[PDB]
UniProtKB/Swiss-Prot annotation:
Domain spans labelled Peptidase A2: 20-188
Site positions (Cleavage): P1, F99, P100, F198
Organism of provenance: Human immunodeficiency virus type 1 group M subtype B (isolate HXB2) (HIV-1)
Quaternary structure and interacting proteins, as annotated: Homodimer, whose active site consists of two apposed aspartic acid residues.
Role noted for this protein: Aspartyl protease that mediates proteolytic cleavages of Gag and Gag-Pol polyproteins during or shortly after the release of the virion from the plasma membrane. Cleavages take place as an ordered, step-wise cascade to yield mature proteins. This process is called maturation. Displays maximal activity during the budding process just prior to particle release from the cell. Also cleaves Nef and Vif, probably concomitantly with viral structural proteins on maturation of virus particles. Hydrolyzes host EIF4GI and PABP1 in order to shut off the capped cellular mRNA translation.
The protein's name in its UniProt record: Protease
Taxonomic path: Viruses, Riboviria, Pararnavirae, Artverviricota, Revtraviricetes
Transmembrane segments: none
Active site, renumbered: D25, D124
Region entry Dimerization of protease, spans: 1-104, 49-154, 88-198
Domain of life: Viruses
Length: 198
């Protein structure tokens, strides 16, 4: 199917004999599920995100059926606020991001121009809003807390900010704060006609 990004891109998955809902997340390298019962051995792992890091259990060779497609790979389990399907499984179901078409074997980075500056940012279907690392932006803003895989961060909310993303113009909200990576979220992805296809 093709999916636009006006809403969170959620899918139904079956793993370990259980049914769950998960977010197709182009900004995630790997799949991370909330605590659940999985069969077999696993290795202790630390992963980072917005908010910091979390400790997860790493299971390999885990069979997952994501929509009507089967895939085998690494599944991380731990204190994530939402189940996410990352790129290492997205590639297995043939998922692409279109706006150019882009496969997901590598992080989907784009060049953006904002506030007269050039930066690189990750097209992130798992992010509601756009979040950039500290930078100089003109004008007024509002304090705001946003949540992510490792907890919450305080950001500055700038509205009606012009961004040119891969040479497409869009105006929307941009959050600025201690994110580890610049991410372009759904509220700007919709404005450049981005879709997920698998």
């Amino acid at each position: 199917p093709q999916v636009t990004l006006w809403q969170r891109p959620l899918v139904t998955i079956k793993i370990g004999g259980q049914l769950k809902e998960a977010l197709l997340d182009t900004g995630a390298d790997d799949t991370v599920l909330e605590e659940m019962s999985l069969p077999g051995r696993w290795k202790p792992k630390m992963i980072g995100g917005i908010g910091g890091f979390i400790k997860v259990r790493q299971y390999d060779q885990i069979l997952i059926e994501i929509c009507g497609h089967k895939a085998i790979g690494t599944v991380l389990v731990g204190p994530t606020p939402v189940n996410i399907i990352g790129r290492s499984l997205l590639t297995q179901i043939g998922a692409t991001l279109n706006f150019p078409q882009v496969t997901l074997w590598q992080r989907p980075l784009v060049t953006i121009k904002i506030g007269g500056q050039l930066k690189e940012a990750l097209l992130d279907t798992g992010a509601d809003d756009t979040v950039l690392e500290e930078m100089s932006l003109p004008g007024r803003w509002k304090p705001k807390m946003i949540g992510g895989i490792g907890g919450f961060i305080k950001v500055r909310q700038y509205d009606q900010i012009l961004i040119e993303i891969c040479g497409h113009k869009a105006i929307g909200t941009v959050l600025v704060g201690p994110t580890p990576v610049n991410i372009i979220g759904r509220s700007l992805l919709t404005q450049i006609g981005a879709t997920l296809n698998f």
